[PDB]
Enzyme design. Structure first.
Site, PDB file in Angstrom:
ATOM      1  N   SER B 290       0.838  -1.194   0.000  1.00 40.04           N
ATOM      2  CA  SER B 290       0.000   0.000   0.000  1.00 40.04           C
ATOM      3  C   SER B 290       0.871   1.240   0.000  1.00 40.04           C
ATOM      4  O   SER B 290       2.070   1.174   0.284  1.00 40.04           O
ATOM      5  CB  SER B 290      -0.921   0.036   1.220  1.00 40.04           C
ATOM      6  N   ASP B 291       0.260   2.375  -0.316  1.00 38.00           N
ATOM      7  CA  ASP B 291       0.866   3.657   0.010  1.00 38.00           C
ATOM      8  C   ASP B 291       0.745   3.891   1.530  1.00 38.00           C
ATOM      9  O   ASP B 291       0.061   3.136   2.229  1.00 38.00           O
ATOM     10  CB  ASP B 291       0.217   4.784  -0.786  1.00 38.00           C
ATOM     11  N   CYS B 292       1.394   4.941   2.027  1.00 30.90           N
ATOM     12  CA  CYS B 292       1.493   5.181   3.463  1.00 30.90           C
ATOM     13  C   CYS B 292       0.481   6.221   3.981  1.00 30.90           C
ATOM     14  O   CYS B 292       0.685   7.419   3.766  1.00 30.90           O
ATOM     15  CB  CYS B 292       2.920   5.644   3.792  1.00 30.90           C
TER      16      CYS B 292
END
Ligand SMILES: *[C@@H]1O[C@H](CO)[C@@H](O[C@@H]2O[C@H](CO)[C@@H](O[C@@H]3O[C@H](CO)[C@@H](O)[C@H](O[C@H]4O[C@H](CO)[C@@H](O)[C@H](O)[C@@H]4O[C@H]4O[C@H](CO)[C@@H](O)[C@H](O)[C@@H]4O)[C@@H]3O)[C@H](O)[C@H]2NC(C)=O)[C@H](O)[C@H]1NC(C)=O
Ligand SMILES: *[C@@H]1O[C@H](CO)[C@@H](O[C@@H]2O[C@H](CO)[C@@H](O[C@@H]3O[C@H](CO)[C@@H](O)[C@H](O[C@H]4O[C@H](CO)[C@@H](O)[C@H](O)[C@@H]4O)[C@@H]3O)[C@H](O)[C@H]2NC(C)=O)[C@H](O)[C@H]1NC(C)=O
Ligand SMILES: *[C@@H]1O[C@H](CO)[C@@H](O[C@@H]2O[C@H](CO)[C@@H](O[C@@H]3O[C@H](CO)[C@@H](O)[C@H](O)[C@@H]3O)[C@H](O)[C@H]2NC(C)=O)[C@H](O)[C@H]1NC(C)=O
Ligand SMILES: *[C@@H]1O[C@H](CO)[C@@H](O[C@@H]2O[C@H](CO)[C@@H](O)[C@H](O)[C@H]2NC(C)=O)[C@H](O)[C@H]1NC(C)=O
Ligand SMILES: *[C@@H]1O[C@H](CO)[C@@H](O[C@@H]2O[C@H](CO)[C@@H](O)[C@H](O)[C@H]2NC(C)=O)[C@H](O)[C@H]1NC(C)=O
Ligand SMILES: *[C@@H]1O[C@H](CO)[C@@H](O[C@@H]2O[C@H](CO)[C@@H](O)[C@H](O)[C@H]2NC(C)=O)[C@H](O)[C@H]1NC(C)=O
Ligand SMILES: *[C@@H]1O[C@H](CO)[C@@H](O[C@@H]2O[C@H](CO)[C@@H](O)[C@H](O)[C@H]2NC(C)=O)[C@H](O)[C@H]1NC(C)=O
Ligand SMILES: *[C@@H]1O[C@H](CO)[C@@H](O[C@@H]2O[C@H](CO)[C@@H](O)[C@H](O)[C@H]2NC(C)=O)[C@H](O)[C@H]1NC(C)=O
Ligand SMILES: O[C@@H]1[C@@H](O)[C@H](S[C@@H]2CO[C@H](O)[C@H](O)[C@H]2O)OC[C@H]1O
Ligand SMILES: O[C@@H]1[C@@H](O)[C@H](S[C@@H]2CO[C@H](O)[C@H](O)[C@H]2O)OC[C@H]1O
Ligand SMILES: *[C@@H]1O[C@H](CO)[C@@H](O)[C@H](O)[C@H]1NC(C)=O
Ligand SMILES: *[C@@H]1O[C@H](CO)[C@@H](O)[C@H](O)[C@H]1NC(C)=O
Ligand SMILES: *[C@@H]1O[C@H](CO)[C@@H](O)[C@H](O)[C@H]1NC(C)=O
Ligand SMILES: *[C@@H]1O[C@H](CO)[C@@H](O)[C@H](O)[C@H]1NC(C)=O
Ligand SMILES: *[C@@H]1O[C@H](CO)[C@@H](O)[C@H](O)[C@H]1NC(C)=O
Ligand SMILES: *[C@@H]1O[C@H](CO)[C@@H](O)[C@H](O)[C@H]1NC(C)=O
Ligand SMILES: *[C@@H]1O[C@H](CO)[C@@H](O)[C@H](O)[C@H]1NC(C)=O
Ligand SMILES: *[C@@H]1O[C@H](CO)[C@@H](O)[C@H](O)[C@H]1NC(C)=O
Ligand SMILES: *[C@@H]1O[C@H](CO)[C@@H](O)[C@H](O)[C@H]1NC(C)=O
Ligand SMILES: *[C@@H]1O[C@H](CO)[C@@H](O)[C@H](O)[C@H]1NC(C)=O
Ligand SMILES: [Zn+2]
Ligand SMILES: [Zn+2]
Ligand SMILES: [Zn+2]
Ligand SMILES: [Zn+2]
Ligand SMILES: [Zn+2]
Ligand SMILES: [Zn+2]
Ligand SMILES: [Zn+2]
Ligand SMILES: [Zn+2]
Ligand SMILES: [Zn+2]
Ligand SMILES: [Zn+2]
Ligand SMILES: [Zn+2]
Ligand SMILES: [Zn+2]
Lengths: 762, 767
Positions: B290-292
């Site tokens: 995922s992105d953060c």
């Protein structure tokens, strides 16, 4: 497809295949040293298998790709790429090989027993070794151009309806545990390990899914639409396929003729993508083959597509890579013209097949398996594991001590349509055997005086053979009747219409029981026949189920009868009362009873009274079984699992019991372990389900061997209404064998634990 | 997620990440000869990579598995399995490394230009070599415990809306061809080939998908729901991801914060399974991060799940393997307890990560890449490919002969908020550089007498600084103004609000132009600014776009200005007039014009008038371009072409329909490199509306001497000619087409595609 007049494929149990599909090719290997492919990456034995296959496929024209999506692939002559046959049979020995007709070489292959009998031995090592020998023999034939490198085996569909003409080919009615165990042992034996780098032979698990009838009620498999609940799909129709893809890492799978819930298996992306690849981890570069020819049936008669071009395109896009038939090679060109498929989709399928061929050593002359030859066939056959499987599997159902035949027995009356059995012993999908030892010949070789009479046919209403049979009986010390069913009765393409003994065989047995002499009856065949009249007839001393015993069949049987070997087989299907099949339609796919006409199917759900239960089998001695309990599954699943690839494989605990030979005959021992619950998970609750089995080596009188049966997390899971596999908290009880000699109560505590999330259908 | 007061993630452009997520770990390698794992299959270097990873994972407790689904993985101390960092930045050089602060080793890494400028060079070999250097430097840091083995790069989202605060990070606005080319060259350079057995560094193509805004209209990316047609999804928002997965065989991919058609990207099985795995052949044991922290955003603010436990479950089941954040490690335990996930699902994801670590030589001390060290950073940095990229990428937009600066130019008035640029040259996601050569230091090094004045701030509103800048101009032989935008204007978490020159920079430029001296304007930054008043002002002699030129930025700029090197960059986005962004919502994701507020987006569809067009760029010379040869027949049968063998190409759609060939003659006074973009258009092939044109190829040629010629050969792949139907299918349509060489359209070639339509890609149905 190749019919000459109108053919109703909704009724006809057999397709009309083109000669091309059915042809026997002469195979060979590409010349990677001097041939046209020598500088292509495919001939670089140090490169990755995918990259090798990709390099090869890049060289094909579109038409060449398309032609090579059929089972009888022509290869590409201009590339020095020989024809290759995908359709090879290995169910219980090599078949559809190009057998020699003279010359003393490659004239035959080992004919093992039908899997139904082999599985009755309850011996995992046995199944694995048979598979290993089959794949050794496959490589040998392959090395002389007489066999392919992938096999349309094993058939692991559940033997659900007892009249299925093909149940004989299977490891029984317990899809979840017993069939899955067979699946794993057989596939790893064929493939030479668990997805080994150097594949031995590629297995093709079949038939996915919902296929377990030929033509009951004149509704052909070819046009059948199986209406199956998601719960039953997860619970009964697919667990063996999960086992094949996840645990065994089968390189191939065969999609079935029939539809499930309106969708032909071979055009079923929920089956071939969502389940097979995304839920069960089927190898990335594994490939799917259709049944012969299930792609054609997507059009005719399923009408899921309007023509052959569209049927081809739908199947290809759903996940079927190879067509056993001519619909792909003769119509995917139209699909392409119509824009229904891309060259990308076609290349992927052919690339998958060749990636496996690369892994199989097709392009590498120095490959370990490329040096197996005829002497390896001779040597593995001489191990006599075919004999051994038959000896371990034969089931003693009834006996008053008449077996083993006492030393006093010197002459025997050998009666029945199975008494001189040779090819009958081979069942189906068999090639030439090195020899076939009949019960008659084996009886003579055992040293008995033999009065042989046919008595009556398998399915006759003629009695003109009765008199001589009774006559032979009246002047003999014991009667051995061998009858039952064979492939004239149960076969691919035609189910039985009933599950009673055929013809007038039971009358002849009755008249033989009233002669005054000891009477042993051998009930042969794969499916069961209703032997209640024999069970209740006190003058029938002994009853044996002998299955399809293979090439050394007679000797296996008569070593059991004479007591040279002690029987230990157990039934792997239920022997139902004859009326069972008349009570409800046999193509009702619901396993559970419905409070109407469906009484429940298999030992798991059946609310009636079996003549002989799933797991029935007696010994030549007696055994004394003795035991040797709150489990938190969430906690158990929280621990490390060294030695197990998947977490659901770990034991919740191990069932430990002592098995004493309290009798006076040396004997091996077999056990089925069942579990049941009346409060864990959703209602209705099963009778019980099998969670383990084992076979132990010969135990001497007074001696005690230890039975240890791990109880895996996966085995205690139950299936909900959505198909999810969940281990539920509650009270359970183990029961050892049908006789339930030992029982053990335990409780599962903690929250419900999800083992598998069943995906939504498309 | 770690907000101290109420945080509105529908509006707030930046998340509040826990310290654990943001932590700088010290990394090491397991000891496979002597440690606890020595007899485990993971330490058998002759075994299969999957089997090795499976053997290791079997040793974990459930909690250890769960804790190692986060980017800052703690490993398993009892097994001698070190902590491992999944979050490593490499966009244009190493970032988030554990840089030393003293000792002379590992205090810095090479700072390349931002990819926006590198891409302007139109040089594939350059992008690949940069990526190869970055991954060499990554391994060198890795071998001293200072960096991981997988990188959150490249960012290849199409720079669609010109105000995007992160378009600077990308290879521009052409998602299909230009961005896909960069994607391929960079990922294979990072990974060390095309899915090689021995992986150098794992790439993570991002951001998948529909992500191209930070917080336009105060609608934060964290809660943004993109409404995108299936056609646009296939045509514009995903073709670079097909390229990454299929051709480049990227080992990882990052799913975006945003939703697309109501489904968060990280909880989107259509994206992560159907498209990524089944359609484009993303590696079986590749993994998705995922992105953060996009997993958190599935719950808050998307409300696709009701809590963090459910958000974790849904993201995991959809195909997200690693969480950049603490939603997974601190709530998957709850997911398991609630029966929402199986241990099987969790194991697969960790096995996926470790399967790549095995391939990267994490368990094999004799691996080829495990001996790279500080000397290799020093060596690769000293090649000065950072400088080279900048000098190749710089774009000459306007010139009358003032550039290159003649020998008569001895003194210069160096004016502007970019004139003494050091850290500004590094854009974003940068670590410490070896040095930073400002345009000021560079001008002085090159021998000019420099009169330096700030003049005005980037976003200045005062004229107080004007007078000294004007005075400096009057004393000097030429004025070099350096300004534009920087990361105070465009950044991660905050888009621009307009696309005009910021502050009063243009007013200062106007007054500098009234002085009566030669005037050169350097327009800096990634995004473009409306330079129409510079274009029309005859007293602005020259205009240059210098992007973000990296560590040697000053020298690259002045080597161009002095004529030591000759410019050849072309714009990789459209320079729109300022009005563009105020005409229609910038989260209108439809590329096509609609006859209402939407004038069409990008050079492909835009119906207005660019200030400077995509592909704009001038030289220090002129070229004469002429068609070299065409195939005897200009009627191409695609079905027939695709039916032939295709040796040398893995995929059939990669084969040329034909090759565009031209002779490029230097017809001027000065030796120069050459760049070309090749466009195609159709007025009848495929469905309406028909676009302006679309890029089908590009190239860069080596220095051509005055009067000499060079050959330009640009293959036209089948995939390049395919159009996208209303359902997302990629189909090559029969009809009439025309190639046009460059924005000036110096050479044009009409051809016809004949025969039936050919399907190149069947776009799958959404769930
Ligand atoms: C090709 O590659 C080679 C090899 O890497 C490059 O050569 C290096 O070039 C750099 C930059 O010119 C040079 O670094 C300078 O070294 C000087 C002497 O050692 C230093 O005085 C100077 O320090 C300044 O920069 C520091 C940044 O870390 C500042 O922190 C410090 O304060 C210094 O800044 C002062 O001076 C500047 C102007 O000099 C002024 O603006 C400030 O206000 C302040 O007063 C640099 O570190 C390296 O020594 C060279 N390395 C080698 C091995 O030769 C070459 O540049 C490359 N060529 C191209 C075209 O890119
Ligand atoms: C469960 O099944 C396994 C696997 O089949 C079984 O173990 C096997 O037992 C058989 C029978 O004893 C073994 O077969 C022998 O193997 C050796 C090779 O090492 C051969 O030399 C032998 O061949 C000679 O002997 C035969 C019988 O006397 C003759 O018929 C033959 O012509 C030869 O002269 C013989 O084939 C076999 O080795 C093992 N297999 C393995 C893998 O161990 C096991 O007994 C079963 N378990 C239980 C509890 O029943
Ligand atoms: C154990 O394996 C051996 C070796 O394969 C088996 O021996 C073989 O037994 C068959 C059947 O009796 C013999 O075939 C017969 O041979 C005679 C004379 O050649 C022929 O006239 C018959 O028509 C028949 O083909 C075969 O010769 C014999 N081979 C060898 C090498 O001994 C043996 O049967 C196996 N044991 C068991 C229990 O299955
Ligand atoms: C698709 O392929 C099939 C099989 O090659 C073609 O059918 C053949 O047509 C040829 C040429 O007319 C005949 O000589 C053969 O006898 C046919 N073979 C069979 C097996 O039927 C079919 O015409 C092709 N269709 C297209 C559009 O190319
Ligand atoms: C039992 O079956 C065998 C094999 O089918 C029969 O053996 C055949 O006997 C005839 C002579 O009567 C030979 O010419 C054939 O070669 C034999 N067949 C084979 C395949 O070897 C035998 O007759 C049968 N015994 C009976 C009916 O009592
Ligand atoms: C395109 O970029 C490549 C790769 O960076 C350039 O080739 C490099 O040129 C520099 C400077 O002359 C050399 O130091 C490198 O050794 C070269 N690298 C490689 C891998 O060849 C190339 O000059 C550029 N091409 C054009 C046409 O300008
Ligand atoms: C799931 O794991 C998280 C992380 O370990 C647990 O959160 C901790 O809970 C303890 C006790 O409730 C608190 O003292 C800490 O503040 C939490 N730690 C962190 C790092 O946030 C959580 O309790 C676990 N939940 C369940 C149901 O097991
Ligand atoms: C241009 O920028 C550089 C770099 O920021 C400035 O250099 C700093 O200047 C101060 C005061 O002169 C020194 O004490 C620092 O040591 C310098 N820092 C670095 C990193 O070099 C420089 O002053 C600026 N020049 C002008 C003319 O404004
Ligand atoms: O297990 C499959 C079988 O389903 C088919 S059945 C096939 C039907 O068409 C003809 O009659 C063939 O001779 C028959 O085998 O065969 C392939 C097996 O692998
Ligand atoms: O490309 C991604 C970025 O989208 C995120 S943005 C992240 C937001 O939270 C903090 O402020 C961080 O400093 C910032 O990077 O970061 C990871 C990149 O790989
Ligand atoms: C074969 O049978 C199909 C129906 O299954 C029928 O449509 C067709 O006419 C038949 N073909 C021939 C040649 O009789
Ligand atoms: C074909 O067989 C099916 C199933 O047996 C039957 O329902 C149908 O009446 C038959 N159709 C024809 C045209 O004979
Ligand atoms: C099936 O069809 C055949 C006619 O071919 C017929 O003899 C038989 O009675 C039918 N069976 C049933 C159950 O209808
Ligand atoms: C073939 O069948 C498909 C539907 O399955 C249909 O769309 C197509 O038009 C048909 N083609 C022809 C030539 O009949
Ligand atoms: C079962 O185990 C889980 C996790 O180990 C624990 O949290 C729970 O309290 C246990 N419950 C019982 C009833 O033992
Ligand atoms: C953080 O923000 C959320 C909403 O985004 C809010 O519900 C909560 O109050 C905030 N937490 C703290 C500790 O302020
Ligand atoms: C959060 O921001 C959104 C969008 O900017 C807005 O609609 C909403 O009112 C804000 N919510 C709160 C609680 O301030
Ligand atoms: C979390 O939210 C989900 C819905 O996404 C719901 O089903 C579940 O019960 C919730 N769990 C808790 C502990 O509130
Ligand atoms: C300049 O900006 C500052 C700070 O925002 C403000 O105080 C001032 O009024 C502005 N002046 C002009 C002329 O815009
Ligand atoms: C194009 O090629 C295909 C495949 O060879 C052929 O069938 C068709 O006739 C050709 N069409 C034209 C217009 O040349
Ligand atoms: Zn040679
Ligand atoms: Zn040769
Ligand atoms: Zn083995
Ligand atoms: Zn090897
Ligand atoms: Zn057709
Ligand atoms: Zn060591
Ligand atoms: Zn390279
Ligand atoms: Zn190697
Ligand atoms: Zn909310
Ligand atoms: Zn949303
Ligand atoms: Zn929680
Ligand atoms: Zn405006």
């Amino acid at each position: 497809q190749n019919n000459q007049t109108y053919a109703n494929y909704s009724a006809q149990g057999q397709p009309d295949l083109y000669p091309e599909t059915l042809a026997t090719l002469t195979l060979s290997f590409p010349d990677c040293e001097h041939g046209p492919l020598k500088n292509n990456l495919v001939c670089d034995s140090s490169a990755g298998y995918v990259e090798r296959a990709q390099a090869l496929i890049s060289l094909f024209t579109l038409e060449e790709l398309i032609l090579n999506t059929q089972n009888s692939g022509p290869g590409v002559p201009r590339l020095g790429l020989p024809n290759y046959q995908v359709w090879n049979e290995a169910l219980h020995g090599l078949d559809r090989a190009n057998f020699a007709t003279k010359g003393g070489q490659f004239e035959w292959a080992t004919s093992f027993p039908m899997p139904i009998l082999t599985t009755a031995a309850l011996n995992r090592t046995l199944i694995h070794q048979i598979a290993d020998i089959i794949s050794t023999q496959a490589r040998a034939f392959s090395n002389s151009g007489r066999y392919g490198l992938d096999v349309y085996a094993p058939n692991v569909n559940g033997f659900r309806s007892p009249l299925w003409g093909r149940g004989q080919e299977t490891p029984g009615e317990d899809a979840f545990f017993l069939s899955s165990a067979y699946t794993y042992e057989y596939i790893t034996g064929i493939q030479g390990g668990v997805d080994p780098e150097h594949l031995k032979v590629a297995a093709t698990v079949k038939h996915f899914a919902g296929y377990d009838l030929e033509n009951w009620n004149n509704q052909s498999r070819l046009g059948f639409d199986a209406i199956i609940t998601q719960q039953d799909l997860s619970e009964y129709y697919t667990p063996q396929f999960l086992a094949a893809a996840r645990y065994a890492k089968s390189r191939s799978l065969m999609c079935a003729y029939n539809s499930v819930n309106g969708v032909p298996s071979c055009a079923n992306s929920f089956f071939l993508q969502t389940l097979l690849r995304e839920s069960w981890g089927f190898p990335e570069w594994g490939y799917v083959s259709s049944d012969c020819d299930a792609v054609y049936n997507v059009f005719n008669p399923h009408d899921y597509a309007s023509n052959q071009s569209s049927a081809a395109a739908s199947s290809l896009r759903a996940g079927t890579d190879i067509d056993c038939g001519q619909t792909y090679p003769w119509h995917l060109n139209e699909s392409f013209v119509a824009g229904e498929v891309s060259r990308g989709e076609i290349e992927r399928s052919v690339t998958r097949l060749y990636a496996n061929l690369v892994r199989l050593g097709y392009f590498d002359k120095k490959n370990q398996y490329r040096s197996l030859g005829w002497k390896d066939v001779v040597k593995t056959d001489a191990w006599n594991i075919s004999y051994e499987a038959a000896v371990e599997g034969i089931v003693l159902l009834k006996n008053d001590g008449t077996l083993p035949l006492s030393k006093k027995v010197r002459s025997i009356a050998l009666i029945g349509p199975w008494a001189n059995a040779t090819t009958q012993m081979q069942g189906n999908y068999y090639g030439p055997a090195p020899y076939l030892i009949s019960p008659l010949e084996a009886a003579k070789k055992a040293g008995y005086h033999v009065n042989f009479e046919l008595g009556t046919e398998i399915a006759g209403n003629s009695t003109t053979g009765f008199a001589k049979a009774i006559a032979a009986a009246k002047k003999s010390d014991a009667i051995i009747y061998l009858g039952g069913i064979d492939n004239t009765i149960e076969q691919e393409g035609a189910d039985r219409t009933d599950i009673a003994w055929p013809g007038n065989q039971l009358d002849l047995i009755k008249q033989l029981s009233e002669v005054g002499k000891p009477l042993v009856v051998l009930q042969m065949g794969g499916g069961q026949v209703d032997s209640s009249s024999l069970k209740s007839n006190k003058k029938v001393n002994s009853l044996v189920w002998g299955g399809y015993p293979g090439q050394s069949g007679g000797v296996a049987l008569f070593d059991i009868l004479s007591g040279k070997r002690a029987p230990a087989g157990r039934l792997v299907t239920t022997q139902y009362p004859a009326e069972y099949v008349h009570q409800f339609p046999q193509n009702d796919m619901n396993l559970r009873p419905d409070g109407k006409s469906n009484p429940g199917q298999t030992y798991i759900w059946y609310t009636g009274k079996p003549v002989y239960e799933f797991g029935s089998g007696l010994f030549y001695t007696t055994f004394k079984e003795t035991l040797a309990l709150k489990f938190n599954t969430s906690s158990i699943l929280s621990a490390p699992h060294p030695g197990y690839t998947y977490s659901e494989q770990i034991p919740v605990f191990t069932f430990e019991a002592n098995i004493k030979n309290s009798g006076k005959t040396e004997s091996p021992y077999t056990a089925m372990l069942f579990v049941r619950t009346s409060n864990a998970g959703p209602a209705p609750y099963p009778n019980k389900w099998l969670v383990g089995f084992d076979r132990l080596a010969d135990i001497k009188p007074g001696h005690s061997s230890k039975l240890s049966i791990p109880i895996p997390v996966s085995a205690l899971a139950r299936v909900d209404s959505h198909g999810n596999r969940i281990v539920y908290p509650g009270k359970y009880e183990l029961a050892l064998n049908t006789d339930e000699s030992v029982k053990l109560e335990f409780e599962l505590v903690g929250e419900e634990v999800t083992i598998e999330n069943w995906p939504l259908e498309e």
